[PDB]
Amino acid sequence: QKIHVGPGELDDYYGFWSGGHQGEVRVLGVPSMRELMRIPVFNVDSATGWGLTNESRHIMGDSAKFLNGDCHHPHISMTDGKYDGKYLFINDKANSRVARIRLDIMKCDKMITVPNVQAIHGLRLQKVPHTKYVFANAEFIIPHPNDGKVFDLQDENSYTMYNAIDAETMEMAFQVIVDGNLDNTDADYTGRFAAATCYNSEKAFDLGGMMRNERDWVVVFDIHAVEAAVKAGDFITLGDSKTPVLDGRKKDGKDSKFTRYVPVPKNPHGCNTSSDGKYFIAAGKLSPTCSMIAIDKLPDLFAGKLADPRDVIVGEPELGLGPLHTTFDGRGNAYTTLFIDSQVVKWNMEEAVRAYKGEKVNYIKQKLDVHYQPGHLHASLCETNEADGKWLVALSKFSKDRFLPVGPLHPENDQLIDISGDEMKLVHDGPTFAEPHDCIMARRDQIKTKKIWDRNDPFFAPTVEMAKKDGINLDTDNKVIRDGNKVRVYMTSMAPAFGVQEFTVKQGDEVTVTITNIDQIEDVSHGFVVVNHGVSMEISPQQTSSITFVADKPGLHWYYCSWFCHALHMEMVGRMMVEPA
Amino acid sequence: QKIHVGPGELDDYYGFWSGGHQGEVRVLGVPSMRELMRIPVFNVDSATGWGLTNESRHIMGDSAKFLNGDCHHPHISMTDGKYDGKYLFINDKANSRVARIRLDIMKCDKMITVPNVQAIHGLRLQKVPHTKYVFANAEFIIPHPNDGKVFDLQDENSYTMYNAIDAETMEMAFQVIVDGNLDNTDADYTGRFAAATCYNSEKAFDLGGMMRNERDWVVVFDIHAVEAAVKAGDFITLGDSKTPVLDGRKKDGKDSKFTRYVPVPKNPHGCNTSSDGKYFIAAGKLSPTCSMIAIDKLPDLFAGKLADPRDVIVGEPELGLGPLHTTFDGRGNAYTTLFIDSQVVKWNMEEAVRAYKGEKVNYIKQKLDVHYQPGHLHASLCETNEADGKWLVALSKFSKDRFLPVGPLHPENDQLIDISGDEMKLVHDGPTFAEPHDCIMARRDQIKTKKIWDRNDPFFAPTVEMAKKDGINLDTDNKVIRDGNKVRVYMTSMAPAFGVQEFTVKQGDEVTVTITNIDQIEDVSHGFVVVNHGVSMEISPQQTSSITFVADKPGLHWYYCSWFCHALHMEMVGRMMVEPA
Ligand code: CUA
Ligand code: CUA
Ligand SMILES: [Ca+2]
Ligand SMILES: [Ca+2]
Ligand SMILES: [Cl-]
Ligand SMILES: [Cl-]
Ligand SMILES: [K+]
Ligand SMILES: [K+]
Structure with a gap:
């Protein structure tokens, strides 16, 4: 055997x-x-x-x-x-x-x-x-x-x-x-x-x-x-x-x-x-x-x-x-x-x-x-x-x-x-x-x-209902919604690029990032890490994933795709800009 | 080859x-x-x-x-x-x-x-x-x-x-x-x-x-x-x-x-x-x-x-x-x-x-x-x-x-x-x-x-040094020390028994448990988990390990050894008794 x-x-x-x-x-x-x-x-x-x-x-x-x-x-x-x-x-x-x-x-x-x-x-x-x-x-x-x-x-x-x-x-x-x-x-x-x-x-x-x-x-x-x-x-x-x-x-x-x-x-x-x-x-x-x-x-x-x-x-x-x-x-x-x-x-x-x-x-x-x-x-x-x-x-x-x-x-x-x-x-x-x-x-x-x-x-499903309440179509949309000190970023992702490659917030804002991976080839997973913020998640083809964190540090803060996805993986990045309190 | x-x-x-x-x-x-x-x-x-x-x-x-x-x-x-x-x-x-x-x-x-x-x-x-x-x-x-x-x-x-x-x-x-x-x-x-x-x-x-x-x-x-x-x-x-x-x-x-x-x-x-x-x-x-x-x-x-x-x-x-x-x-x-x-x-x-x-x-x-x-x-x-x-x-x-x-x-x-x-x-x-x-x-x-x-x-070594200043010999001691709202439990462990099997605290106490595994047989590791308190750790032969948590819930709270260590593993347990605030 x-x-x-x-x-x-x-x-x-x-x-x-x-x-x-x-x-x-x-x-x-x-x-x-x-x-x-x-x-x-x-x-x-x-x-x-x-x-x-x-x-x-x-x-x-x-x-x-x-x-x-x-x-x-x-x-x-x-x-x-x-x-x-x-x-x-x-x-x-x-x-x-x-x-x-x-x-x-x-x-x-x-x-x-x-x-x-x-x-x-x-x-x-x-x-x-x-x-x-x-x-x-x-x-x-x-x-x-x-x-x-x-x-x-x-x-x-x-x-x-x-x-x-x-x-x-x-x-x-x-x-x-x-x-x-x-x-x-x-x-x-x-x-x-x-x-x-x-x-x-x-x-x-x-x-x-x-x-x-x-x-x-x-x-x-x-x-x-x-x-x-x-x-x-x-x-x-x-x-x-x-x-x-x-x-x-x-x-x-x-x-x-x-x-x-x-x-x-x-x-x-x-x-x-x-x-x-x-x-x-x-x-x-x-x-x-x-x-x-x-x-x-x-x-x-x-x-x-x-x-x-x-x-x-x-x-x-x-x-x-x-x-x-x-x-x-x-x-x-x-x-x-x-x-x-x-x-x-x-x-x-x-x-x-x-x-x-x-x-x-x-x-x-x-x-x-x-x-x-x-x-x-x-x-x-x-x-x-x-x-x-x-x-x-x-x-x-x-x-x-x-x-x-x-x-x-x-x-x-x-x-x-x-x-x-x-x-x-x-x-x-x-x-x-x-x-x-x-x-x-x-x-x-x-x-x-x-x-x-x-x-x-x-x-x-609850994330989709959140998005629909913001008037977001997750399959297509790239938009930043502001609500008091809350910021909700919604973006599509398609290797080797995030749909929103930069966004600006105020120091102390609570930021929710919602990412929908619209690659349709199996196994093209994306990642999302915010440098030095303790933020990390996976987004697989046709998944939506969201993560929430406080922008408590002023300055430029990079984010990147953690899942090797394309020859231009290293370049799949973006910038969160945080304005001083 | x-x-x-x-x-x-x-x-x-x-x-x-x-x-x-x-x-x-x-x-x-x-x-x-x-x-x-x-x-x-x-x-x-x-x-x-x-x-x-x-x-x-x-x-x-x-x-x-x-x-x-x-x-x-x-x-x-x-x-x-x-x-x-x-x-x-x-x-x-x-x-x-x-x-x-x-x-x-x-x-x-x-x-x-x-x-x-x-x-x-x-x-x-x-x-x-x-x-x-x-x-x-x-x-x-x-x-x-x-x-x-x-x-x-x-x-x-x-x-x-x-x-x-x-x-x-x-x-x-x-x-x-x-x-x-x-x-x-x-x-x-x-x-x-x-x-x-x-x-x-x-x-x-x-x-x-x-x-x-x-x-x-x-x-x-x-x-x-x-x-x-x-x-x-x-x-x-x-x-x-x-x-x-x-x-x-x-x-x-x-x-x-x-x-x-x-x-x-x-x-x-x-x-x-x-x-x-x-x-x-x-x-x-x-x-x-x-x-x-x-x-x-x-x-x-x-x-x-x-x-x-x-x-x-x-x-x-x-x-x-x-x-x-x-x-x-x-x-x-x-x-x-x-x-x-x-x-x-x-x-x-x-x-x-x-x-x-x-x-x-x-x-x-x-x-x-x-x-x-x-x-x-x-x-x-x-x-x-x-x-x-x-x-x-x-x-x-x-x-x-x-x-x-x-x-x-x-x-x-x-x-x-x-x-x-x-x-x-x-x-x-x-x-x-x-x-x-x-x-x-x-x-x-x-x-x-x-x-x-x-x-x-x-x-x-820093834990050993800290224990000394508390007047504790880690190699032998099974003891509880108190200072205001803090409780330091020190114990040895040998399969199938914790050296301290019960202790009593007041609701709100910050508890530090320090365990020294005094087994000398290779591969006889112990564990320590406090049920429903998010507390977990390994203690290998001759290792000392410590962990700190708040006793924020009154009542009896069991702790147990997580590492299968003896025929009597299931019975390697103890009780933390928390008196109501
Ligand atoms: Cu997207 Cu690597
Ligand atoms: Cu000690 Cu199982
Ligand atoms: Ca270049
Ligand atoms: Ca019995
Ligand atoms: Cl190399
Ligand atoms: Cl069974
Ligand atoms: K992979
Ligand atoms: K083992």
């Missing part, structure tokens, strides 16, 4: 890599593992102006004031348990957000700060009949209200919440209060259930405290019941947020309609749905096991036809030290990372289930050593009923001597493994910055991208 | 790629072309906290207020015309800066904003006896003073300057006022001469004007002459800058001792010294030629022993449409990018010099098609007398369909070419983000890096 992609050949799959603590999404080609694009999300990108432009800051909202993020879990929207290539969603653990990327344009187009929570970590998407909800965990227990009067984690009103976000509007759909906490989450192949791991059933703040119980749990959600109750008006609201909040905690040993708690050892981490839709599989972490929940049995467990939530457990195979995550080949095998043993282990799921019933059968097929300390792993199409069993990527946290030395900070090592046959074979070591946690792969044919921008694109 | 670096195998060279309009520097392994590390410079990095930490912000100075940069030209310090592996230097065109990276820790340790200029573009280093100076072009003509009274470029006080920076102290050494402008720059193999291309001899602000003259020039600097005048005290100063300024403009047709202007067609761009030290080679851009300046004729030219400046031109090879840059195989051949024709042309310098004198000889050896529109190019060790003729990288601006489609914004195509034989061979297409402009290669054995930090390292 494959591995090398020569000059002029194309990769077979797209890979969407989390940027981890660096805050972007990275687009790679697979199997070459080459990075094709960076999509700024929670990071400020000097190149495109993400975090500086008026269009980006509108999307970010009030959260545009943060210069950091911490992303882990990239996921592609689904239709009937297959990728539809519409959206990618990702979490921000640092500043508690979820963002949506439009895959047609490879840009973040929506962002939300989840209300009344701390630390968005686990994230996954409804699969069936389609991604109606984005599911996301808030990891940390906090007081409600968090007003500084109570700090105790055991308080009646100290808890965390499971979050559902409407995938299309990117507005909150509902929140569910839970016992313990939340780590990772996955969804079924019907749309009725979702599940999450919990490592802090103790509601402790100290290490020993958090490891006290032999068992924490997987919490299972009946979204049907949730939706039913929201429809009926049977919910509370918290603070000034209008989001429906349901109580999924236990009361005096009795369940809520919304949740069931399945005991699982021990500070479990991964929560993974098998490609056949049979199981939620929780990785044991401190327990050298995985726990297999039979989704089949969940209706009976919510109907109470079951005397014990442990009865939904149909497998608990011992695999090795520190199991963290599980993926699938669609051939009946599961692949689990063993952080401590530094291996990926291949195991047979139906054999594991028979072994749980006492049968003497070896469900373990192979252990591949990886380099070093694997976290997540991802098999091609593993989140869909189309799991194709071809490629596997294991994402390891300590690269040691696997790459040239680069100082005290090392890359992560994302290792590509061919799983197409009977024996797993390590084929590529991929260094990556700032710790991608997870990644997702999609077939080439699953992603359709725009070659050039549409003038009606929603990404800059 | 080579090409594929399999798992467990190591690359043969380091590549340092400029990060372009993105602002960082990128470390690659060559020939695999995989990215090993990102080093933040002008960008704000969420992962390591560059632009957020006190250490980084002190390095940036007043410029820390900018979130962007635009870099082009990375260069490694030299001893005796060979790479010494001490420092890498890079420009910022956006906000007029030069940065120094220490190659032992792979971090930016110094930064300067060049005074009284706009837009630092061309940058190269002194070769012999070693890198005493960093040479840097200010591209854009401005008024002096630039106070808004005059905007005219033709004003006798409107000009740009050539800049020299002390490589060791990173303070300005001198500036030289020039006629016209400055684009790219190189230095000879003795320390006496430097050279730069000019495209705006016209002092124009528009395309018509900038393209008028059949010829602009290469300006040549007699650095010895300049240094003499600084030593003599024969210089002026501009504004509040104490930097010695020398006047290298012709007056009434008369030459200064500092400069000579050599007419060259037309808007020339590349300015490259051959690895045998014989020629300054200017790429003709709008002329389909390069111009070769014999460096051994330069003493005569400054001595007044030559009839006209054109007497130093010893070759003017006709290469093809849009020649931009030139590199060297150390075997007597040059390689030039042709932007319009979209090719790299291999040519013999000796034979081109003979053809200029009349001889009939085809100096052109081969033209290789590249994909597409090449900007810079770089052969292994080309900036040194050790040019080894193994690898060539051509960095093309338009990748078209050479990679999977990723929307309207395309990657650059940095193509790896085997030049070890007589025939150039394309072996690899490397996609890159944000337009690297140039790159530089060095042998594995030319770079030596730290495995772990030294506690005495100058990078965070």
